[PDB]
Design a protein around this ligand. Sequence first.
Ligand code: CA
Lengths: 358, 342, 350, 362
Amino acid sequence: HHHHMNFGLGEEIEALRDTVRRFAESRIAPLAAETDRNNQFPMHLWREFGELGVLGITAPEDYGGAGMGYLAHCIAMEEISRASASIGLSYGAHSNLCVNQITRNGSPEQRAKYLPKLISGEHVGALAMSMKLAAEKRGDRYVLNGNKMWITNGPDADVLVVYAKTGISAFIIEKGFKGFSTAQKLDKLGMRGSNTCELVFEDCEVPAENLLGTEGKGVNVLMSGLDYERVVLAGGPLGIMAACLDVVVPYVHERKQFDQPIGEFQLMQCKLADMYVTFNASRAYVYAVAAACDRGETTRKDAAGCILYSAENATQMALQAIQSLGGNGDYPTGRLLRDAKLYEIRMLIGRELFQETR
Amino acid sequence: HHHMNFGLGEEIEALRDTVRRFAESRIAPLAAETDRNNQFPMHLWREFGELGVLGITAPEDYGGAGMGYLAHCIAMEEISRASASIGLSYGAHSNLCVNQITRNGSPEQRAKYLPKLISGEHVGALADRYVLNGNKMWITNGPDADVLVVYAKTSAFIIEKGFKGFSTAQKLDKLGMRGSNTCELVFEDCEVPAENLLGTEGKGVNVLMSGLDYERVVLAGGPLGIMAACLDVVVPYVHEREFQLMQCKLADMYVTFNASRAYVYAVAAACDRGETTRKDAAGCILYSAENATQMALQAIQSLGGNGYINDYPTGRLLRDAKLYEIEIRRMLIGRELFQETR
Amino acid sequence: HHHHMNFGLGEEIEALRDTVRRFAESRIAPLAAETDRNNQFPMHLWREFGELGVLGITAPEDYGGAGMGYLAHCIAMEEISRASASIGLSYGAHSNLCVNQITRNGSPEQRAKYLPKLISGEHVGALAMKLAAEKRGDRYVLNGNKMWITNGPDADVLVVYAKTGISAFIIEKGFKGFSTAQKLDKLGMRGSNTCELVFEDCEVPAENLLGLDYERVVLAGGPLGIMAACLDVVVPYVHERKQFDQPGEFQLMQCKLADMYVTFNASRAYVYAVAAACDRGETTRKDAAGCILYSAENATQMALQAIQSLGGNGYINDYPTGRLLRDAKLYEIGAGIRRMLIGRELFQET
Amino acid sequence: HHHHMNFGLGEEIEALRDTVRRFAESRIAPLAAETDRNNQFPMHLWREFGELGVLGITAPEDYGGAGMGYLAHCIAMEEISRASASIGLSYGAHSNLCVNQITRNGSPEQRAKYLPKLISGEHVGALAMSMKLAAEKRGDRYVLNGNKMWITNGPDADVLVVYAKTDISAFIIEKGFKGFSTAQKLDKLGMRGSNTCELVFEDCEVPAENLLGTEGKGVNVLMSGLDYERVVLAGGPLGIMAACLDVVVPYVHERGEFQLMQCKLADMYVTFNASRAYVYAVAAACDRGETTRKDAAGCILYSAENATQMALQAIQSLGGNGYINDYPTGRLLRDAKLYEIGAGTSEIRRMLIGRELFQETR
Ligand SMILES: [Ca+2]
């Protein structure tokens, strides 16, 4: 494969990329198709992810994390999603949405208690941001009622970060908590095998020690990670685009023959060029925004920008891959398009830009 | 506030600011007049020289800045932001001519030609004795060039304006990039000394190909500057004129602009690392050029009726942007990707 | 539904559209999901299509046909495909690909024999456009195979092309040497029975020797129907999404509606125009290919947009937006390189 | 030229098309480049247009009109714009915006007075939609104050249909009316040679006999023409797309690159005839008397955006030559852009369609 431009990100990130790629190719790619058809996450991967050392990329090394940044995590997300977008999505919700939320907003006691098992992979994590859920203080404990829809890793999550109205607070939920239950997992068009379901809270008793950050200050807790976390998830669309090229490039080689129609080769090369450029332009944009996050710089418009841009590019590139293979497309290109659409599912960028320039 | 920060380091951030301040005060006021008169303001050459931007990638030993292509691209960007025409002329001089002599010239050739080119006393262009006959069309800075790098079949040559047999035709009347002097080069029994042969005889294809990449990357700053100029106009205008659809249009301009910058900067940085590659060079100029043209149309659209008046610069931005687009880039990228993945 | 522009096509065509639309709504749409799920054509529809009088739209009235044109047939195809693209494809292969070929290229004896049962729906028809035929006195001997044939497993009558340079034949299910393979389980167009045709020393009488663009234009009704189905889903949804807590989202949704509306009706205008040109007998080679390519691609993008507009609700495998995408994709595959043919025609003509 | 699909529109419309095409080829096309360069309308064309009988396409024959429909007029607009987009725009503002408004909303006396000279080309007409202009009844006369911007044929117009506020009302204005004046004509990016300027009203005295339709019901007069205006003027983008093909197809002949050019040619051909199909259909609907508010906006929106993008492709196909002012590709791009701006922007057009579609399905 030679459709990846080098961004000179340093030996450590390039080693991370290569490590994840070899793992994904041997342990993820062979079960990608079966995962989509059966609509089931292969649960054995969680412990393997842990031993690979990728479930806590941006988590402190004191809890078993790698102590790396969002650029590194985005690329780990990319290479995993490249083999399977569904598994990539589940991985992202765990290692980025859940773990990094506890990492950033958790008390020292909360980090020491919940992070080690999440980073090792013995526990699966989830995040329920988006009010359908209300929390009520009752002396020593909190009482939660309401629901949360469309939660990745919902059915399997042992630890869940959940937002509820008090005006907003965040809580750490354990699977074993009384009053907490999960409904039947969704049967989706794409991202099949990424277990998604409804969370149900009926008089759920949550200890005060499980309150995440300050009470009434949940929106800033939401806002805190959301920009940085959303950038990591842009690795999903990046991975799908990589997968598109993984299919098309060898296909163009197999199809280059004397019996090939007079002009189909040159048109295929032009299609390849557009895919190549779109892929690496998206990477450039996302990586830059991720690197800006690592520098601690505000990236609100560009974070949203790079996710929007890359998500749409992935969808259109998947369609171009299907178009390019024609009749012959057995191939996973159908899955790539279906998967891409979920990430795609502007005024915020424009509104903030307008208000900043007043 | 439509510029994302890419953390490019203190020296490059200092260069950008230096070039920006010069462009705003010394270039921008003359932008409209340059397009109208279809004439380059010749006084800028010495001012560019004194600014120290005509030899960005040239060695400090010849008066150059000794910086890289990322720095040069950004200088190109900020200049083109004030005037795309002048930016184009600047790029042809500082990159097409100067960097070619820098890379492929013998120590004596550099010592002879670079100092005056970097100072701005000479204008540069890119197209026992040697006799060159024939012609070259569409040469930027052609009518004014004192020193010219020219490719011929035997090879690359250094041509001086005073050489017998060398002449220039009437400058072009273009849709855009007006004031960027472009003309035909004419060679009729032109006598060129053997000492003016550039690099090795028969190895001119490697010389030509080498510079093309750096050209595509540095000149990609052109479209970047034009897109910046689009935002420079539209953002204050929408305030003077909140609606939901306009904010979406603004968002697209903003995102496209910074995505283009990200790609171009990365390729430029790759060149500085020596990881230079043909398809990504071709890729980022192709990408940014197409984006610039479409954004110019959107800039015109955003100003409405006023955007369609020659008083406002949006009309010029569209006309300027189209030249950078002027199949070959996509076929080069596809062919290159194919052969690497065989 | 108010996303259909009126093209003033006349009382007879408008009556056809309304009749087929009412039939599709009552008899096709309710089984659309089950048809896709089970990958089986509901065989009872053939006789119902027959009694409706739509299996011989371009067939002579003397054999039970409607005696109408390709514009009319395209629109019947559209309204059926609107309810189910799979059923539309099967209907198109029968009433258009098979019947109209026999109508146009069949001898009077061949028409009187094969058309009546096809038009009534008692017989199912198919077209097979790797196969060799050899003249041997009174009979023809066919050997080879034909892949990806719609209505293949159920076809009683098949129009088949073979190499000699090329000739067409009318094949009966009962012909010795003729057999059909297991039907395909495809990603989309599920419930449109498709299979391989197999010819091993197949004996065909000389009396069954027979004698595409116009027919290809009618099939553009498929994508048109799919786009119509996209709007059928999206327009009521935007109403449901219009709420008190909403949201800048409403205005953007309406703009999205406008684009879908324009794309849909522009596609119809182009396809209908080419269809009408076919009825006039005017050469339409580049324009036939143009409108099929254009509408097919538009259908796929609109299916993606329909998924986009419904959000989470659109992303469940239960909903028909998933089906629209799968169906649309097959039409774009079958209509494709296509552009180079058109350009070549324009260049060589000039 | 073999890049036109035939729509079987009948002998009368085909006869009109051929007549206008042959005229445009001989009398308009040679003057296109010079018209753009000088930023001046060739005034001799008005009388020539008149004798050709195309200034009153949808006007009654009793006033010298052709008594034809909007489909015919759209095609006249197309073939003229094909030779010169600037001249096409001026022609459209005169023959459609002004003349058809007087035809539809004028009293018998108003039609008998103003139409003959407009249709003959002796008078130039204009329409001023866009409030900024106020009118006050003073017995026998009206007194107008305010201004109207961006008026095609403004500097040259002898007769102008103007909309004003009463608390909206429409009026027929003559150049000689006291208080009426015009500012210096615009220096535009494109449509150069289509004279555009500001109208200025300073105590402009207008007779009561020049009031168009009913007072206070000017919005209905305005909305009425806008629909028909968008459809006929859609011939502009159609003509520009036709002009793109007129340039590119012969050029590729004179010149693995060949295969890519053919694919580009195909896209241009398909986009062109798809646009025609849509616009012609909406025009035919207008002739049937079938109101099509969203479809009128729809077909102009569609064709205008297609024309601009095709112009960019035309420039690209000619390469270096396409970027030279000698060649017409530069002008086509500059001209096409106005239609995306004019007669309401693309934004207003999409929202008009969406809003209308939403309320019908309520
Ligand atoms: Ca009949």
